[PDB]
Structure 1
Amino acid sequence: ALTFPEGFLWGSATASYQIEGAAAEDGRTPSIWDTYARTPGRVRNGDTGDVATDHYHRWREDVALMAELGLGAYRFSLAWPRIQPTGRGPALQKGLDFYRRLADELLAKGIQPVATLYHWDLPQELENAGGWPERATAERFAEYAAIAADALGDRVKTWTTLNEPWCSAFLGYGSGVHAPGRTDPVAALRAAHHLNLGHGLAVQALRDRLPADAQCSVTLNIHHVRPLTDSDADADAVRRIDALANRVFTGPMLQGAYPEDLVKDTAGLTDWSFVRDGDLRLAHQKLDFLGVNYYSPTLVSAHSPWPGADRVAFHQPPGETTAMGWAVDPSGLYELLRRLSSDFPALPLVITENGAAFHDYADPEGNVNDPERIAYVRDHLAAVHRAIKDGSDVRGYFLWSLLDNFEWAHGYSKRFGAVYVDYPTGTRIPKASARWYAEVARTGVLP
């Protein structure tokens, strides 16, 4: 039985469009995912987040569920489309009211609210104007952040600017398998830069408008890249993918410069002239901790998410697989954490996302048994604890997710929740893993 450090944060995570529902209620306007999901062939079975888990109406019950599970923190995203419809103009108070009430309820329960400003639900109007490949979007994101800070700053002390910008830029504009569904390598690289810029401008605005004790951060899905063989070519491959998956963001955000090799690898695609003088300094803002998302490692040797790395080829990492068919490999998380500790020694780490999808089902007696999810989480928590033992500064872990929800292009076909959701009724059924995880969050001990 392993014991986690004094003060370790135990929470769960969700995203606005994935759980909220009420897509066309109280002033909210369509985001890129609303458009993308209603587009034939884009999302499995034509599923949309119109209703999702109906969290917008069941928010009270969900917070109470968090309390019963003894969670200390709740990571959620703010729907830009609700707070500032269209991505420009004045704030919509009714939109902000939903989060005021939510945050207030969390606090009343002794649960620390952690808000992510941007979790992919870009207002469609900003996409109509160019989306992330267009510079103005970054400036608009900063204004939105100031609006959010100004309204919720007194109740929410932990903030995250962006969640997994890699997926947003490369899957959204590179391979187009995510909203808005575009496919252009340069567009994807411009999007990456503008996400870097937006993040910076946002942290600047957060720093400026929030109390002096608030915590600002960014959530990155750090790809842990490994080579198929020892070949020297496979090592070059690892470098290319690491630069595209991680350093294109950690470079500017944490070091104030794009890695030279990345610039070199993409020289055939672009000259990065859209990186205006001073953009890198703006993207490089002081953070209180880095949010890390991890699920599985990467094994390597006009329409892809890796512009400039066509010479490379990916492989299925070894290990059992989840419903997503992603390899289960706790070691990937341990190595990943050590890498980060080595590269950014002074940067406290928080696992803002980790979990697994399995084909759960509610039996005739009303129970949902997910022993496989219990194993996955336990195994990854052990890797985390091990990383901590060896020196890594990890301060928290957020299980993805509290509720089964709209898993983007996969629709509702993938269940990641600690709590099962009967979609037609919206009924929540805590799974066996919820009961097990509750014990870990109450004792701080991992059996």
Structure 2
Amino acid sequence: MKFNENFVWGVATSSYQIEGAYNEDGRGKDIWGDYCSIPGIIFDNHNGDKACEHYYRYKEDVAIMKEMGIKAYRFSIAWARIFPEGIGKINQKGVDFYHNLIDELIKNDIVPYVTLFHWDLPLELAEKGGWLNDDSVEWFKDYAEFFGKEYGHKIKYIMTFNEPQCTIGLGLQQGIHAPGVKLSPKAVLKSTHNLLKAHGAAVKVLRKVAPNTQLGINPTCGVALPISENKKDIEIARKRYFDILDLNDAYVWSVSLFLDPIVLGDYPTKYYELYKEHLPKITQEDLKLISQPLDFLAQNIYNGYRVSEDENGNYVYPKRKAGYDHTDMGWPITPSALYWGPRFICERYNLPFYITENGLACHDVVSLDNKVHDPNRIDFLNKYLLDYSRASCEGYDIRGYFQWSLMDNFEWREGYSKRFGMVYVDFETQKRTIKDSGYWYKKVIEENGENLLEH
């Protein structure tokens, strides 16, 4: 019994990365399409105008998902495809599209998992300040309210914000993601506060208009890994994993900054002390709105880092061995992150836990045999599921795993130079090719993980 019988095996995509049709059927502009229009921002000036054309080819992608026997599909809704201006007028062809997509999923016995916001903020609301605007809490509530009223009767799982660490940190504090700016701590924490408030308002209104839909959120962070399994070393990694970082660091990359207000009802104590001169207006109704009860907690986990302390109690980060296992991103391959991550999150928050994203980039090619061989992805996934199974076997309330991605897509700043899918996509012909990892993943679902090679 590596995993439980109810375990959920899924793949994950996002709207801007696969859909295409950025300027068709009344879809409004968003921040990433706007971000891409700045020359030199994206690798080779790629954009998401066409992407994988999933908007037009969704039936084929669902047929491919049935071919691999995938029972759950995580995807995101393009806010600008339903509300071209963020608020007000409804774009029916965008409403019809997600109807056609959802119906195709149900028709093929695939359970939809919906992400409301996957970074594609409607450009009209960004030009109104984005998450700096206190009205953004209402913009997202009305967005969530319409989606719950229109689709709640056939969507059982909804998560609000995918990886707010990127939207806030890379987008507004580090200038790495859209809109690409580096704002003040006041702006960043005010933007953080309104995003959390928008999350809670979305949860509260979805309990009213879609009461049979389970709600959650999937943040992300590097997983602090203990140097050994001694209680003294595990506590160092646990403290770092939920720490609040200094203002001169990339302080948005914190687990507790977002999830402690959501699950525990307030920011950590360190937040009020370190950020005292940059604190936003925080009322108790704010914290009450943010801390709505959730049905599940999720997390995108890709890698982790060893962490320790010296004599003075300062964090020490040991080097990685020369030639260490890595991906086409240069990211390290650390399968133990899928154990310590879920373990730390479950112990601190005690909610049903999903892994919403896990995977790696591989320099995949269509070989001479017209197949795509990615055994490195098979090894990466197999090793990560082994440590994830250990957490399930140890009694933690683990519910599922969504492998990023289903198909190669637009990898943001990297464009199409990085391939994360188990399905190969030639971005000219739009020809799909299932990789060896896809057929291997089909057997994993059918065996519920009892085929995972050990050691």
Query: Which TM-score applies when normalising by structure 1?
Result: 0.92
Q: Is the 8 A contact 2:73 2:113 kept in 1?
A: yes
The Cα of 1:352 is off from its aligned counterpart by: 0.8
Mapped partners of 1:105, 1:235: distance in 2: 42
Which amino acid counterpart does residue 251 of structure 1 have in structure 2? D
Contact (CA 8 Å) 2:132, 2:187: kept in 1 or not?
Answer: yes
**Partner residue, 2:272:** 263
CA 1:317–1:277: 2 relative to 1, 3 Å: farther
Of 200-209 and 213-222, more deviation after overlay is shown by: 213-222
- Does the C-alpha gap of structure 1 residues 314 and 99 become closer, same or farther in structure 2, counting only changes over 3 Å? farther
| 1:254–1:236 distance in 2 versus 1, CA, 3 Å | closer
The answer (yes or no) to whether the contact 2:12–2:403 under 8 Å persists in 1 is yes
Residue 200 of structure 1 aligns to a residue whose secondary structure is helix
- Aligned residues: percent identity? 42
Q: Which residue of 2 aligns with 1:328?
A: 333
1:413 is paired with a residue of what secondary structure? coil
- Residue of structure 1 equivalent to 2:192: 192
The 5 Å alignment of 1:389-408 reads 389-408=393-412
* Post-superposition CA distance 1:92-140 (Å, at most 9, x none): 2211111111111100100001110100000011110101122111210
How far apart, in 2, do the equivalents of 1:148 and 1:359 lie?
Answer: 37
- Alignment partners' CA distance in 2, 1:69 and 1:330: 24
Partner SS state of residue 221, structure 1: coil
SS at match of 1:278: helix
* Counterpart position of 1:284: 291
Structure 2 residue 96 is matched with structure 1 residue 97: yes
Aligned CA distance change for structure 1 residues 47 and 316 (closer, same or farther; 3 Å)? farther
Write the distance in 2 (CA, Å) between the matches of 1:73 and 1:56. 19
Cα distance change on mapping 1:85 and 1:315 into 2, 3 Å: farther
Counterpart of 1:127? 126
Q: Alpha-carbon deviations, 1:266-291, whole Å to 9, x = none?
A: 235x0223x34411110111111111
Query: Shift of the alpha carbon at 1:225?
Result: 2.4
1:305 maps to which residue?
A: none
Structure 1's 323 and 277: CA in aligned 2 closer, same or farther, altered over 3 A? same
Separation (CA, whole Å) in 1 of partners of 2:8 and 2:394: 19
1:354 paired residue among 352, 358, 364: 358
Would the aligned equivalents of 1:378 and 1:446 in 2 still touch at CA under 8 Å? no
Q: Tell me, in whole angstroms, the C-alpha distance in 2 between the residues paired with 1:299 and 1:26.
A: 48
Instruction: Give the counterpart letter for 2:262 in structure 1.
Output: M
Q: Once the two structures are superposed, what CA deviation does each residue of 1:335-394 show, in whole Å capped at 9, x if it has no partner?
A: 11111221123x100111111111000012211100000001111111111001111111
- Is the Cα–Cα contact under 8 Å of residues 3 and 393 in structure 2 kept in the other structure? no
Alignment of 1:124-273 (within 5 A): 124-184=123-183, 185-210=185-210, 212-226=211-225, 239-241=243-245, 244-268=253-277, 270-273=278-281
Equivalent position SS for 1:25: coil
1:202 maps to a residue whose letter is A
Residue type of the alignment partner of 2:263:
L
Deviation at 1:243, TM superposition (A): 8.3
Q: Which amino acid aligns with 1:342?
A: E
Q: Does 1:295 align with 2:302?
A: yes
Q: What amino acid sits opposite 2:270 in the alignment?
A: D
In the TM superposition, what is the alpha-carbon distance from 1:264 to its structure 2 partner?
A: 1.5
State which drifts further: 215-224 or 392-401.
215-224
Matched letter for residue 327 of structure 1: P
Look up the match of 1:421. 425
2:114 aligns with 115
Instruction: Report the AA paired with residue 190 of structure 1.
Output: K
Structure 2: which amino acid aligns with 1:105?
Answer: E
SS in 2 for 1:86: coil
Question: Which residue is 2:75 aligned to?
Answer: 76
> Helix, strand or coil for the counterpart of 1:74?
strand
Instruction: Give secondary structure in 2 for the equivalent of 1:258.
Output: coil
Counterpart in the other structure of 2:311: none
Amino acid at match of 2:429: T
Does residue 60 of structure 1 match 2:59?
A: yes
**Which letter does structure 2 place at the counterpart of 1:250?**
L
Q: Distance in 2 between matches of 1:234 and 1:61?
A: 44
SS at structure 2 position matched to 1:173: helix
Kept after mapping to 1: 8 A contact 2:193/2:280: no
Structure 1: distance between partners of 2:388 and 2:26: 42
Contact 1:316–1:327 (CA<8 Å) still a contact in 2? no
> Structure 2 vs 1, CA of residues 179 and 207 (structure 1 numbering), >3 Å: closer, same or farther?
same
Q: Is 1:374 aligned with 2:378?
A: yes
Query: What is the alpha-carbon root mean square deviation over aligned residues?
Result: 2.2
Secondary structure in 1 aligned to 2:153?
Answer: coil
Q: 1:57 aligns to what SS in structure 2? A: helix
Is 1:364 the counterpart of 2:368? The answer is yes
Aligned counterparts of 1:252 and 1:236: Cα–Cα separation in 2: 17
Give the distance between the partners of 2:225 and 2:420, measured in 1 at CA. 26
Partner of 2:248: none
Q: Deviations over 1:387-420 (max 9, x none)?
A: 0111111111101000100011111111000000
Match of 1:342 in 2: 347
- Tell me the TM-score normalized by structure 2: 0.90
Q: Deviations over 1:295-344 (max 9, x none)?
A: 0114568xxxxxxxxx9897765541111111111112201111122112
| Distance of aligned partners of 1:35 and 1:312 in 2 relative to their CA distance in 1, 3 Å threshold | farther
Q: Is the 8 A contact 1:32 1:122 kept in 2?
A: yes
Q: Which secondary structure state, in structure 2, belongs to the residue aligned with residue 292 of structure 1?
A: strand
* 1:106 equivalenced with 2:113 (yes/no): no
Residues matched between the structures, number: 432
Contact 2:10 2:71 in 1 (8 A): yes
